[PDB]
Design a protein around this motif. Sequence first.
Motif, PDB file in Angstrom:
ATOM      1  N   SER A 276      73.577 -13.947 -21.723  1.00  0.00           N
ATOM      2  CA  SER A 276      74.148 -14.811 -22.768  1.00  0.00           C
ATOM      3  C   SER A 276      74.956 -14.025 -23.805  1.00  0.00           C
ATOM      4  O   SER A 276      74.634 -12.889 -24.121  1.00  0.00           O
ATOM      5  N   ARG A 277      75.993 -14.655 -24.341  1.00  0.00           N
ATOM      6  CA  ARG A 277      76.818 -14.053 -25.378  1.00  0.00           C
ATOM      7  C   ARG A 277      75.985 -13.563 -26.549  1.00  0.00           C
ATOM      8  O   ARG A 277      75.017 -14.200 -26.947  1.00  0.00           O
ATOM      9  N   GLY A 278      76.334 -12.402 -27.074  1.00  0.00           N
ATOM     10  CA  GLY A 278      75.654 -11.880 -28.252  1.00  0.00           C
ATOM     11  C   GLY A 278      74.509 -10.932 -27.970  1.00  0.00           C
ATOM     12  O   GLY A 278      73.987 -10.312 -28.897  1.00  0.00           O
ATOM     13  N   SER A 279      74.124 -10.780 -26.705  1.00  0.00           N
ATOM     14  CA  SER A 279      72.996  -9.949 -26.341  1.00  0.00           C
ATOM     15  C   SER A 279      73.222  -9.304 -24.990  1.00  0.00           C
ATOM     16  O   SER A 279      73.958  -9.839 -24.186  1.00  0.00           O
ATOM     17  N   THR A 280      72.584  -8.164 -24.732  1.00  0.00           N
ATOM     18  CA  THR A 280      72.642  -7.567 -23.398  1.00  0.00           C
ATOM     19  C   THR A 280      71.373  -7.849 -22.576  1.00  0.00           C
ATOM     20  O   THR A 280      71.228  -7.374 -21.456  1.00  0.00           O
ATOM     21  N   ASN A 281      70.431  -8.608 -23.129  1.00  0.00           N
ATOM     22  CA  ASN A 281      69.224  -8.903 -22.403  1.00  0.00           C
ATOM     23  C   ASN A 281      69.551  -9.672 -21.095  1.00  0.00           C
ATOM     24  O   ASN A 281      70.338 -10.621 -21.123  1.00  0.00           O
ATOM     25  N   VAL A 282      68.960  -9.236 -19.980  1.00  0.00           N
ATOM     26  CA  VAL A 282      69.092  -9.916 -18.695  1.00  0.00           C
ATOM     27  C   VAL A 282      67.832 -10.751 -18.449  1.00  0.00           C
ATOM     28  O   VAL A 282      66.723 -10.219 -18.440  1.00  0.00           O
ATOM     29  N   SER A 283      67.989 -12.061 -18.302  1.00  0.00           N
ATOM     30  CA  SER A 283      66.852 -12.965 -18.101  1.00  0.00           C
ATOM     31  C   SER A 283      66.683 -13.303 -16.618  1.00  0.00           C
ATOM     32  O   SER A 283      67.670 -13.538 -15.935  1.00  0.00           O
ATOM     33  N   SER A 284      65.439 -13.334 -16.115  1.00  0.00           N
ATOM     34  CA  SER A 284      65.212 -13.868 -14.771  1.00  0.00           C
ATOM     35  C   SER A 284      65.134 -15.378 -14.917  1.00  0.00           C
ATOM     36  O   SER A 284      64.645 -15.899 -15.924  1.00  0.00           O
ATOM     37  N   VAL A 285      65.668 -16.094 -13.949  1.00  0.00           N
ATOM     38  CA  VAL A 285      65.749 -17.545 -14.075  1.00  0.00           C
ATOM     39  C   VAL A 285      65.273 -18.181 -12.776  1.00  0.00           C
ATOM     40  O   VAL A 285      65.430 -17.599 -11.687  1.00  0.00           O
ATOM     41  N   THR A 286      64.649 -19.348 -12.904  1.00  0.00           N
ATOM     42  CA  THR A 286      63.978 -20.007 -11.789  1.00  0.00           C
ATOM     43  C   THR A 286      64.633 -21.338 -11.353  1.00  0.00           C
ATOM     44  O   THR A 286      64.334 -21.854 -10.279  1.00  0.00           O
ATOM     45  N   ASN A 287      65.510 -21.886 -12.180  1.00  0.00           N
ATOM     46  CA  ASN A 287      66.168 -23.155 -11.871  1.00  0.00           C
ATOM     47  C   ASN A 287      67.621 -22.923 -11.446  1.00  0.00           C
ATOM     48  O   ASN A 287      68.152 -21.857 -11.646  1.00  0.00           O
ATOM     49  N   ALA A 288      68.263 -23.942 -10.906  1.00  0.00           N
ATOM     50  CA  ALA A 288      69.662 -23.815 -10.501  1.00  0.00           C
ATOM     51  C   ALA A 288      70.429 -25.111 -10.551  1.00  0.00           C
ATOM     52  O   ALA A 288      69.845 -26.178 -10.604  1.00  0.00           O
ATOM     53  N   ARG A 289      71.741 -25.021 -10.445  1.00  0.00           N
ATOM     54  CA  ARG A 289      72.570 -26.220 -10.469  1.00  0.00           C
ATOM     55  C   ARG A 289      73.596 -25.986  -9.409  1.00  0.00           C
ATOM     56  O   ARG A 289      74.194 -24.918  -9.331  1.00  0.00           O
ATOM     57  N   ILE A 290      73.818 -27.019  -8.607  1.00  0.00           N
ATOM     58  CA  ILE A 290      74.877 -27.026  -7.618  1.00  0.00           C
ATOM     59  C   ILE A 290      75.847 -28.131  -7.972  1.00  0.00           C
ATOM     60  O   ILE A 290      75.420 -29.197  -8.388  1.00  0.00           O
ATOM     61  N   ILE A 291      77.143 -27.898  -7.816  1.00  0.00           N
ATOM     62  CA  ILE A 291      78.126 -28.953  -8.050  1.00  0.00           C
ATOM     63  C   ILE A 291      78.801 -29.240  -6.733  1.00  0.00           C
ATOM     64  O   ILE A 291      79.337 -28.309  -6.106  1.00  0.00           O
ATOM     65  N   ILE A 292      78.809 -30.508  -6.331  1.00  0.00           N
ATOM     66  CA  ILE A 292      79.493 -30.933  -5.112  1.00  0.00           C
ATOM     67  C   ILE A 292      80.618 -31.898  -5.424  1.00  0.00           C
ATOM     68  O   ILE A 292      80.691 -32.463  -6.510  1.00  0.00           O
ATOM     69  N   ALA A 293      81.523 -32.032  -4.478  1.00  0.00           N
ATOM     70  CA  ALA A 293      82.594 -32.997  -4.621  1.00  0.00           C
ATOM     71  C   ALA A 293      82.755 -33.785  -3.351  1.00  0.00           C
ATOM     72  O   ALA A 293      82.586 -33.258  -2.256  1.00  0.00           O
ATOM     73  N   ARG A 294      83.105 -35.060  -3.494  1.00  0.00           N
ATOM     74  CA  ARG A 294      83.281 -35.925  -2.346  1.00  0.00           C
ATOM     75  C   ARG A 294      84.465 -35.384  -1.539  1.00  0.00           C
ATOM     76  O   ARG A 294      85.529 -35.128  -2.104  1.00  0.00           O
TER      77      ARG A 294
END
Lengths: 114, 99
Positions: free
Chosen positions: A79-97
């Motif tokens: 994230s902007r403003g920090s160098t911390n690297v976060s582990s993340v468990t969720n996701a988002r996919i974007i699809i299109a017709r």
Amino acid sequence: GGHLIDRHVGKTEAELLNRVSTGNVKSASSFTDRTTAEAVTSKAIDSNQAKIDSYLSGSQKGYLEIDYQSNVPIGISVSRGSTNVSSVTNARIIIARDPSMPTGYKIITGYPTP
Amino acid sequence: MIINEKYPYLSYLLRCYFNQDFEVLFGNADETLAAYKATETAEERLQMKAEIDYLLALSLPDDELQDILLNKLDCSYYYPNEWSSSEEWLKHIYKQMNH
Ligand code: NA
């Protein structure tokens, strides 16, 4: 063109950190590796198949968001403003017709979400 | 409830259009807004505008409105680098929808 999900597979900390300083995003994330990106993509599609089916048959929307929730890390985020690297468990996919595809859609992009 | 259950129209703009890849897919923030306008129905953008109005009418402290746009609705575009406040950026989105 390319497959934009690849901008979010196996990226280095350096690459992601550059996007949130020089670039203009609030945060940037990447799946750990291709096997993980593929596994998450498949699980997210399968767990949202009802939502995809309604979207294809009834909707004039250009895109559809499908979210994936878990309790196991699938990638990293910065994230902007920090160098911390976060582990993340969720996701988002974007699809299109996309009637020309066998499923009726194409995957536009996808990435982990905090 | 979850915020995108009640603000789906802004969530759609901010998550599907202002995704992390908006510069590659659409271009700059205003080219992104133009792609949304061109692609989506008039009904879609009028419902998105109605949600902007629900936010603007509250006159929230900027830090709270920014948390809503960036973190809760999860916009990937860091608009504060171009805009003095979240109110001003929302007023800009609203105006970009017009003829
Ligand atoms: Na989670």
